[PDB]
Structure 1
């Protein structure tokens, strides 16, 4: 139907906007601490600590399958990146500190992304 196509166009437009949000968020992680999943070879116990792991590569695979229906879904995954890191790692670590900086800097980007998703429907 034409209605299905139109909904598909909206999903595609959202996907384009989220790809740019994701690039902007990832630039706030120049050390690439959050680029890839935590390795179970190198942290074999990781899943005893963290139930829903997340990373920018895994978000990117979801995005390119148009797997985010709205900004809320995408923000949930971003928040998992940060929140997982701040539980597993201690406060005095390079990892925790990188999460805090990503959170603070990403908040600015997401503040305007929320206005752009509302605004352009």
Structure 2
């Protein structure tokens, strides 16, 4: 149907907007602390601590399969990156501190992307 094609164009356009959001968020992580999944070789107990791991590569895979239906879903995954790190790592670590910074600096990027998704429908 033509209705299905239009829904598809909307998903594609959301995907394009989210790809740019994701590059912008990831520049707020120059150290590449959240670039890839936590290694289970190197942190074998990780899953006893954190039930839903997230990272930017896993988000990028989901994105390119147009697996985000809206901004809220995308925000949930971003927030898992931060919230996971702040539980697993203590306050006085480079890892926790990099989450706080990614959070604060990501907040601005997301505040405008919410306006762009409402605005552009």
Normalization by structure 1: what TM-score? 1.00
What is the CA distance between 1:25 and its match in structure 2? 0.0
CA displacement at 1:98 relative to structure 2:
0.1
Structure 1 residue matching 2:66: 3-state secondary structure: coil
Q: Which runs of 4+ in 1 moved over 4 A?
A: none
Offset of 1:114 from its aligned partner? Answer: 0.1
| Residue 16 of structure 1, CA deviation | 0.0
**Could you tell me which residue of structure 2 aligns to residue 66 of structure 1?**
66
Alpha-carbon shift at residue 44 of structure 1 (Å)? 0.0
Aligned length: 121
* Structure 1 gap ranges (5+): none
Deviation at 1:68, TM superposition (A): 0.0
Give the Cα–Cα distance (whole angstroms) in 2 for the partners of residues 109 and 13 of structure 1: 18
1: CA distance, partners of 2:67 / 2:5: 17
* Shift in Å, 1:84: 0.1
TM-score (normalised: structure 2): 1.00
